[PDB]
Amino acid sequence: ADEVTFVNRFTVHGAPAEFESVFARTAAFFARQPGFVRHTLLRERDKDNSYVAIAVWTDHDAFRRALAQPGFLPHATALRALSTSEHGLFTARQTLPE
Amino acid sequence: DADEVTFVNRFTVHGAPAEFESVFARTAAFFARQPGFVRHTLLRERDKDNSYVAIAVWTDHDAFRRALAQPGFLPHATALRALSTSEHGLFTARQTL
Ligand SMILES: [Cl-]
Ligand SMILES: [Cl-]
């Protein structure tokens, strides 16, 4: 649609359990932001410490409003503490089924 | 294992993006006829014309491997290898809201 997809690759350095906890609470916060559509956390099969998150928002503006929230900052901080992140924003060009 | 698998593949496109997308649409269409195909998305990084991520979901690791092993995959792997460089990983979904 007009919808953007945030993809975030995490290299987790500490305990994966602790990382997934910190993540869940991050996910919870975004889940109640206007324009939120969905979120997936992925774990790489042949590693303990590789992860990928995927967040869909209705539009760019909805997403940037969610990031500029003062409520997001402690989640951001906790994640940085526990992981190296390489992230980016995408559009969907082809989807199937659909 | 028995777990749902999400294949994630990063592409840098060196040839025409238009021809890359078209080849991909056919490739997705081929995947769509394979047992255990759940879904497929092709993403493009915003304000980059050459950076793509393809996300393919399969009911398990074996259905995915068997898709890639089919003779009819060969022309689609060939077309993409001529157009792009790529790095992939095999994942399992942990959370979803
Ligand atoms: Cl483990
Ligand atoms: Cl690459």
From Swiss-Prot, chain A:
Impact after mutating residue 80 to Q: Moderate decrease of catalytic efficiency
Domain ABM: 4-90
Record's keyword terms, sorted: Antibiotic biosynthesis, Oxidoreductase
UniProt site (Important for catalytic activity): 8, 53, 57
Any one GO MF annotation of this record: oxidoreductase activity, acting on single donors with incorporation of molecular oxygen, incorporation of one atom of oxygen (internal monooxygenases or internal mixed function oxidases)
EC number, as in UniProt: 1.13.12.22
UniProt pathway: Antibiotic biosynthesis
A GO biological process held by the record: antibiotic biosynthetic process
Reactions that this protein is recorded to catalyse: deoxynogalonate + O2 = nogalonate + H2O + H(+)
Biological role stated in the UniProt entry: Involved in the biosynthesis of the anthracycline (aromatic polyketide) antibiotic nogalamycin. Catalyzes the oxygenation of 12-deoxy-nogalonic acid at position 12 to yield nogalonic acid.
Subunit-level organization: Homodimer.
Name of this protein: Deoxynogalonate monooxygenase
Organism field: Streptomyces nogalater
Span covered, complete protein: 11 to 108 of 118
Curated annotation (Swiss-Prot), chain B:
Pathway named in the protein's UniProt entry: Antibiotic biosynthesis
Root EC class: oxidoreductase
Swiss-Prot/TrEMBL site (Important for catalytic activity) positions: 9, 54, 58
Keywords per UniProt: Antibiotic biosynthesis, Oxidoreductase
Example GO molecular function: oxidoreductase activity, acting on single donors with incorporation of molecular oxygen, incorporation of one atom of oxygen (internal monooxygenases or internal mixed function oxidases)
Single Gene Ontology BP annotation: antibiotic biosynthetic process
Effect of residue 9 to A: Loss of monooxygenase activity
Signal peptide: none
Outcome of swapping residue 58 to F: Loss of monooxygenase activity
Subunit structure: Homodimer.
Protein name: Deoxynogalonate monooxygenase
Residue numbers of the full-length protein present here: 10 to 106 of 118
